[PDB]
């Protein structure tokens, strides 16, 4: 999963944006006796631990603590128009303030694919850290990324 010195991406729940991030340390908090400060479950499973990741773009932050749910391995496979499938989750750049400009790596699923005599249009659903934008059109189709998972 996420080991020290591993290359994984971290997402900011407040903005729902994904950016390159590196793993610096992995740790977990346990209860003093029988009154845990506030954890979903006692430490024991790899998912029951806390991971420390830093943002390469903004390393000044220092050390950030994030759960595995918000941390995912960096994509390693690029999907081309010919390799685009429906129902697959991919990462693309979406800018809610100015969709016609550059956006941050926002997760989204392929909704529908459309081709024209000399133009291509792709439809995908975009989800923000809290707001939803399903049924949205993707201006950039060449920028498509696949998400990798541990498989369990």
């Amino acid at each position: 999963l996420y080991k020290v010195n591993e290359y994984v991406d971290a997402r900011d729940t407040n903005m729902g944006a994904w950016f390159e991030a590196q793993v610096v340390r992995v740790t977990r908090k346990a209860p003093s006796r029988d009154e845990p400060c506030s954890s979903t479950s006692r430490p024991a499973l790899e998912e029951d631990v806390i991971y420390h990741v830093k943002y390469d773009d903004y390393p000044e932050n220092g050390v950030v603590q994030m759960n595995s749910r918000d941390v995912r391995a960096r994509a390693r496979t690029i999907i081309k128009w010919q390799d685009l499938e429906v129902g697959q989750v991919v990462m693309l750049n979406y800018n809610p303030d100015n969709p016609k400009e550059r956006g941050f790596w926002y997760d989204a699923e392929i909704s529908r694919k459309r081709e024209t005599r000399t133009a291509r249009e792709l439809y995908a659903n975009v989800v923000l850290g809290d707001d939803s934008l399903n049924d949205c059109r993707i201006i950039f189709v060449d920028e498509v990324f696949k998400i990798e998972r541990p498989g369990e």
Binding site: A17, F19, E20, Y94, F104, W105
Partner: peptide, 16 residues
């Protein structure tokens, strides 16, 4: 890894 690290292209927001 190497002399420097490579980053992926990504930009958004409304810079001033």
């Amino acid at each position: 890894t190497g002399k420097g690290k490579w980053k992926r292209k990504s930009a958004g927001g409304g810079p001033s």
